[PDB]
């Protein structure tokens with residue numbers, strides 16, 4: 001499908017690709033070098049791991065990148081082929097991978113969750129008092145803004161960490177939202193409250209991403 005295309009820019013076709021599934025189609029296996037990572041993993045984990053890397057390899061193949069194992073590195077972050085970047089996400093009913101060429105794309109962060117209210121207490125634990133106040137006013141009451149905030153915080157971390165290799169807690173970023181007049185999609189900009197020093201290039205002070213609610217899921221993505 002093309003749900004995640006709703007939260008990506010349209011201009012980078014040569015240096016950005018994506019792939020998604022809504023299930024774990026029987027038959028997929030990990031590459032030989034990936035199997036030790038799930039040898040002792042629960043069934044749910046084996047499946048999401050295998051399926052999402054299948055998607056990652058379809059996206060890479062669209063960009064002329066031969067298949068390759070995708071291991072986990074610093075703090076669980078995925079290890080991409082030479083010259084490539086990307087992000088992965090899996091939740092109930094969704095698996096998604098977005099990859100890009102490092103020259104044109106500097107980093108990717110994506111996240112997917114079911115469009116449902118947050119469980120008890122997690123909201124206060126992932127949001128600043130100013131966000132809880134400003135956010136609900138910016139979008140319709142049909143949306144679970146708490147969950148959308150959540151996904152945007154996680155997308156911000158995924159885009160941020162490969163570039164700094166430093167922790168970004170939920171209180172270290174202020175995110176602001178804006179909805180387009182369809183009522184189900186929009187934008188957000190994440191303003192960094194701590195040192196944005198990166199290992200290469202200019203520091204990160206703002207991350208502009210997109211969000212939408214498609215087919216009962218929330219999707220967010222940042223493309224630097």
Ligand SMILES: Nc1ncnc2c1ncn2[C@@H]1O[C@H](COP(=O)(O)O)[C@@H](OP(=O)(O)O)[C@H]1O
Nearest residue numbers: 049075076077078088089090091111112158161
């Ligand atoms: N520090 C980190 N930085 C960037 N990406 C990370 C990360 N830790 C995990 N990821 C990725 O987050 C993915 C899961 O996202 P989500 O929680 O939304 O389902 C992980 O999938 P994998 O463990 O299968 O590689 C991993 O690829």
Ligand SMILES: [Mn+2]
Nearest residue numbers: 048089090091
């Ligand atoms: Mn997951």
Ligand SMILES: [Mn+2]
Nearest residue numbers: 089111112154
């Ligand atoms: Mn997530």
